[PDB]
Every structure is written in structure tokens, then in C-alpha cells.
A paper describes a structure:
ABCC4 (ATP-binding cassette sub-family C member 4) is a transporter protein that is primarily localized to the plasma membrane, and its efflux activity is associated with the progression of various cancers and the development of drug resistance. The ABCC4 protein primarily consists of four domains, namely, two transmembrane domains (TMDs) and two nucleotide-binding domains (NBDs). Structurally distinct from other C-family proteins, ABCC4 lacks a TMD0 domain. ABCC4 can transport a diverse range of substrates, and its involvement in numerous vital cellular physiological processes has been well documented.
The hABCC4-Apo structure was used to illustrate the substrate-binding pocket of hABCC4 and the state of the pocket in the absence of substrate binding. On the basis of the analytical structural data, the resolved hABCC4 protein exhibited an average resolution of 3.29 Å. Comparison of the density maps of the substrate-binding pocket between hABCC4 (Apo) and the other three complex structures clearly reveals the density of the substrate molecules within the binding pocket in the three complex structures. These structures revealed that the substrate-binding region of hABCC4 is a cavity formed by helices TM2, TM3, TM5, and TM6 in the TMD1 domain and helices TM9, TM11, and TM12 in the TMD2 domain. Helices TM2, TM3, TM5, TM6, TM9, and TM11 collectively form an approximately elliptical cavity surrounding the periphery, whereas helix TM12 traverses the central axis of the cavity. In the top-down view, the binding region appears as a fan-shaped pocket. The outer ring of the pocket is surrounded by residues F156, F211, F324, L363, L367, F368, and R946, whereas the center of the pocket contains residues Q994, W995, and R998 located in helix TM12.
Author numbering: 8 to 396, 696 to 746, 756 to 1206, 1211 to 1262
Write the structure that this text describes.
Amino acid sequence: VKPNPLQDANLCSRVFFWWLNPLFKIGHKRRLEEDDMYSVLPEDRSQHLGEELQGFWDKEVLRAENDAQKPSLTRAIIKCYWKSYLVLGIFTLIEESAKVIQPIFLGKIINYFENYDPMDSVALNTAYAYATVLTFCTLILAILHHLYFYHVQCAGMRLRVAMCHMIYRKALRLSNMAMGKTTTGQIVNLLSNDVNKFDQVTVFLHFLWAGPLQAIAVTALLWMEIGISCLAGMAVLIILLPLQSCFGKLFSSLRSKTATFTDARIRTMNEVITGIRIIKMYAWEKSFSNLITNLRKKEISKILRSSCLRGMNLASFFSASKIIVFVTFTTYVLLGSVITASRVFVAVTLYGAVRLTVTLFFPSAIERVSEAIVSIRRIQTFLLLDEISVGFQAYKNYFRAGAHWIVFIFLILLNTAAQVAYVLQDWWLSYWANKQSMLNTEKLDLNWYLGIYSGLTVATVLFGIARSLLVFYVLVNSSQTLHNKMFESILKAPVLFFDRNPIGRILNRFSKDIGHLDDLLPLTFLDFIQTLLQVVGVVSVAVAVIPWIAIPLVPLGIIFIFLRRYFLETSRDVKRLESTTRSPVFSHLSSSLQGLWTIRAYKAEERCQELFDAHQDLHSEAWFLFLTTSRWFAVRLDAICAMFVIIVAFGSLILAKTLDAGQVGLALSYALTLMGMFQWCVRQSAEVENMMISVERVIEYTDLEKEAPWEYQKRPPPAWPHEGVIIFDNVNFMYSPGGPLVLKHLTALIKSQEKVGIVGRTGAGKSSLISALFRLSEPEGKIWIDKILTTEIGLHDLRKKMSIIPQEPVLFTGTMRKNLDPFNEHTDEELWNALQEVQLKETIEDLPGKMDTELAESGSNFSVGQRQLVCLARAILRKNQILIIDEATANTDELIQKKIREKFAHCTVLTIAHRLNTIIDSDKIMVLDSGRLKEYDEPYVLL
């Protein structure tokens, strides 16, 4: 078999995941697909994880049968996993306690500088001991975390597999009555949505008791440093939840209304794409163009609001750590106390450690727990049933379509001001402390030191709001101006492009790509640039204090790109394997659920169970590698993330003779915040690169084949169609520009006021005659019509003066006046008379409006004969001479036949039909053989 290297692995070697190096060396050049992966542990099989849980559930229900109660499911899970829960509780408690000693010892390190005696060597050893003790908390938080995390992630796949196994085992013991109420889709949804929520609960499970405990532990430390003023720092930290709740409940309605706005546009686009030939033959593009541009305008107007709202939310979240500090220190100074460089940075670090933790971990845990509880409830109620008896060009083309270069210069200038204010606000406090420590009465005026502080506080908020608003506007305008180009380019493609591509593809494109361009790109781009700027500023303020940190950063900067490449060259394969191993189990379940009686007939039912287990083992095996390949990177990242802090701390301590307390405190208070921002910045790039494919495939359009322009410079006479004699020459027709031919030298002569019939074998090139007269594809040879040709005339000047009766009618979703008159050029009485003389008036009088009747599902209220009659009404209302009647039916018809035989004023009627009983007493007839056409003068000669 395939023995995994996880077993037989000593300690101090699986903390760095050293047993995964060879696998990468295989995935560097060979692109391993499926046969070079490791199997699962012997204690991770489906049967071993399902049998014990089934036994525990049976024991629990047998115990609950005694009392007059209902058996529960969460008790059976607790009684099985309480050991693992209690084992992980110790480590999560240790990790939560290890985040409090760091500020307490940073305070002592700074206090050593506050009382500095050069003629001493005893306090330096104690300072070195403080630094050594501070060095261990970082190592515990950065190294020993990526193993507990892997274990707490692996502790959920077992529960998921057990639930799936027991659900499938129960599903094969249902009766006919119990099977009649449930459906296959219901079971598929219950297995693909309810169970899959058991992988993100164990991660956010320890944030219900360790959340408030850390807050209470931090709230009591500040009383021993600054006093009552610390409460001022906690009053602002509460308003964030009511601030975000209203934002969410206001954004939901905007999302709903913009969705209900774009749904109609999607439907109209689907209607337009299907049936492009009739629309192109009738020259009815402007109506749909306007109907689409109006809905697009409304959709953009509704999206701008939510965009601005989310931008304001991000701007408010970016600068919440400044108001708290400003308020608490203003209150602390206004009482009468004096500022010190050892009590400010400790409070800053504690605030930064509590606010992000609470506001990012507590709100999500409640939602996760509620979802898990409702899923467990659903699965419990189910189991109680009866039984039986890209490139840089892709970015340039997307950015240069939003504004000029001066706007980009202004945005670059505005990006580097909020961060400068963010850093200067902190530097001002260190300057204050240094100026205070130089005293030897002679107090300091508060006006200057408070006014400058308030100004530096306000500037940050202003420059944080303006940048976000500008970025969101610029990035929405690009999609707004790109959709129009896409639609205008696709509204002029030939039929050749339309017949070689399905409708579902283009519809899914127009929906999903525009959704992605309007929903997820600006948020991700703003988050990425903000998180990158924060890290750049942190590194800059760390280097500006010690000019020697710039030397080791280059070796710590070259390896990062190489590691990123070496990981991404092989990390883009596990998701594909996960998908192609998750699909077959669903396929097997769907195929085996319907074929139930064939399994109960034969005395073999456990074979399907073994097959299901063997199918799920492959998915478990393909999923096992995902967690390890994900955790193999965080260790190498946190290594540098902690080495930087160690280096800066020991370098600041070694050079204790040429600096002071304020600047060393400022330098050390920033190094303890690099981890989360580093992780977010290195993570968002993957999503950006994955989402750029939408832009890639959108720019794929707008550069396609283009037919002849709609109009030329030369204009036809005001009344061109008159005595519509039509001649031909040696003409050759073809569908592809370099493909085979379908006609061979069609030359005839059709005079005026003649009924020319065409009789030929189907599929031998009979319907290819109408596509040559309407020049849907440029043919070969001259086609003279009314003393002029058909090539030097525009398409709209040609297709307008002719009429064609399609083989099958089509009705567009709209009113009654639109389907008969999209361009308002005729009166209402004229249309009423034309509809009366076609013998159809009673079908519309019974309707309420009789003139503005809305039709559902392309006119589902009318019959086929009414469709032929309304097409005839359209043809009569057009009132042209050249009329092409093509019809092939198998079926009301006698009246339309006699009408088209009498109503039309004998204007060059030609027919393309196969029914010989319709070509009777025609002026001229033509016969089609497999390649050519033969014209007969009189039909009496043939008969």
C-alpha cells in the first residue's frame, strides 16, 4: 500500500513538519496527480470512526427510553470527544496566558532605561534576563501554535466522517412510507450542507470562555498602572458592536434590492441572446439596447450606495485604535498626572491586544455555534424515522479605464498621508515624554501639546476616509464603463459566432463575470493595499531608530520570494484533487439511492456500505494533505516574524549607551504587532490572483469579428423599392469564409408581380437562399436589385424594405403595441384596423386593457394559429413589396392561405415550401437538385 510518513516520527521533527520535504520535491517538476500521495492513518478509517459513534448513540437512546424524555445527539458527541476537548483546553489556556507577560516585561525593560546608570553592571544582567524571558513567549506563540492548530482542525473531520457514515447507513433502512415523504435532492442537500459545517466549529469553540476571561484579566492590569482613566479606554471599545450591527442590517436591504434589480436584466439578456437571427433579420436592436442600458444605469446607481457604505465601514475600522488612546491619555493628563515613557506603551500594547482579539473573534463564534446547533438538530430529527418489517497587461487594461493618470497620482499622494499621520501621532507622545524627562515648578503648558495631538488625531481620520471613498469610486467606474463596451461589441457579431457557441455559456459569462467585477474586487484590493502599507510603515519606523537593522533585512527578504514561488508551484493542485474526489461520492450516493429495491432483492446489502466507505476514504486521503500543506508555510513565516522581534530587542538592548527611553519604547511597541498583518497581507494576494481570471475573460471580449457597418456614405433614393425585379449571376454561397460550398451558380430572372415557387429536397440547400438575399453572410457574385447592387448599400437600408414570414413565430416579453410596433411610427386606429382585417379581434377584447396586455412566458396565453396570424399582421403593417414566405408545418390554416392569396397586392411573392399542394397555379417554378437549380417557365409544361 501507500504508507504515510506521519507514523514513526520522533518529536522536534514534526513541529516544523520536516517529514513533508520530499513530497514537494516530487511536485516541483512532475505534477503528481493521484498515485503519489500518502494513505490515511489506521485510526482514521470510516468504519472505525462510525462504529463507536453508532454504539454510543444506541446506548444513549436506550438510556433515554427509560425516562419520558427525548434522546439527544450532542450528548453522544460530548461523551466521545470530551477527552480531546479537555486535552486541548490546557494548551489553549497556556496560549491565552502567554499573551499577557509580554507587556508586563516590556514595561520593565523600558523602566530599566528610565533609570540608567553607566557605572553599573548588575542591572544589565537583570535586563538581559528580562529580554530572555520575553523571548520565550514569542517562540511559544509563533512555533508551538501550528501543531495545536493542525490537531484542532483534524479533530473535526472524524466527526464529519462519522456523521456521514451513520447517515448513509440509516438511509438504507427506510420503509416505503418513510421514503415517500423524503426526496433524493433533500438527502443530497442534508449531506452536502448540514454536515460540512462541522469543520469550522472546533476552531472557534474556545472563544466563548477564553474571550471574556482575557478581557477581565486585561481590565484589571490597567488599574495598577494608570488608574481610573483606563475606564475611558473601555467605553469606546463597546460602541463597535452597535456600530457594525446597524451597518450590516442596512447593507442587507441594499443587497436585496440590487439583486432584484439585476435579475430582470439577466432575464432580458437571456431572452435577447436566444433568437438572434430573427432580431437581426427584423433590425430591432435599438429597443433591446435601450432596455438594457436603462437597467444597467439603475443597477450602478443602486450599487454605488453599498460601495460607499462598505468604504466608510473600512475607513472606520482602520482608525479605531487612535480614538481610544487619545481619549484615555487626554483624560489621564487632564487630571493632574505627569506622562512617563514606561506607562504609555504598555497601555497601548494592551489596548491593541484586546480590541482586535475581541472584535475579530467573539462575534463569529456565536454564529458558528448557532449554525452547528441547528445542523445537529436537523440531523437528529432526520434519524428518527420508521423502519422496515494573468499578466501586467491584464492589470493595465483594467486600471487605465477608470480615470486619467493625474487621478492615479493624486491617489498615490493621498495613500502616503494617513500612514504618516498614524506614525506621527505615536511619535508625538515619545517627544512629549522626552521633553518631560529633561526637567529638574516650571510646568509645561498644555495648550500646545493638546492642540497638536488633536490635529494629528483628526488628520488620520480624514485621510483614512477620503482614500477609501476615492478608491471605491475609481474601481466601480471601470466596470461601469466596461460592461457597455462588452454589450456593444456583442451586439454586432455575425451569426457564425453565434451558432458555434451555446447560449448558457454566454449567459453565465454575462452574469458571473459582471457580478465578480461589481462585488469582490474593490474590497479585496483596498484590504490588500492597506495591509501592505501598514507593514511597510512598521518596518520603516523600526529601521529609522536603529540604522543597522537594514543590513539583515535583505537576506530575510530574498528568501521570501523564493519560498513563495516554491510553495505556489505545488499548492495549486490540492483543490483540484479535493473536488475530483468529492464528486464521485455524491455521484455514487445519487446513483444508489434510486436503485434501492435492486439491493434489497438480493441478499447482499453490506457491499454498498463497503463501496461507500472505500469511496469516502479517497476523499479523506486527498483532504489530509491539505492541512499539512497549509501549515507547512505558517511555520516558515512565523520563524522570520519572531526573528525580527528578537533581533530588534537585543539590538536595542546592546546599544543602551547612545539612545534614550522614548524612542526605544516607540521602536519596541511596534514590533509586537507584525504577525496578523503579515499573515493577512501574504494571504490576500492569493485571492487577488485567483479572482483576476474574471477580468482576464472579460477583456477576452470587446475584440471580436465585425460585420459591415450599418450605413454607408452613399444614400439610396427616398423611394428605392419600386418594380422589384431581381436578377442573378454565377453566384457561390458558403457558410465558413474558407469552408465548403452549398450552392453552385444560381442564375435566374424574377420579374415584377410574379409568384416564384421553389421545390427541392430538404437538406439539399433550400433554406440557404433566404440567407443569401438578406446578405447575412457575404456571397460571391453580383445581385442586382432595382438597377443597383446589394454590396454598396448599408444593412439597415436593405433589410428594412423587405419582409419575410418565419417558419416558427417568436414573441418577446412585453406589451401588445411593442410586438406590433416597437418604433412609434403608426397611429392606434391604423393598428386597430390592421388587426381587424386579419380576423383577430375577439382574442384581445376579453382582456382588460385590450391594448396594453402583458404576456407571460413569451406569450403563453396565445395559440400557434394566433402566432401565425400576428406574424401576418406584422407583415401587413410593414407594407413592403418583396415578401418571402417560408413555411414547413405539419398541422385556421385555410383562411390564412386564402388571405395571403387575396390580401397581398401581387408584389413579387416567392415561396420556399415543400408541400406540393401549396405551389398551385404559380407564375414560375424552380426545381432544386443536389447542387443546382432548374427554372421552368410555366407549371403546365411540367404537368
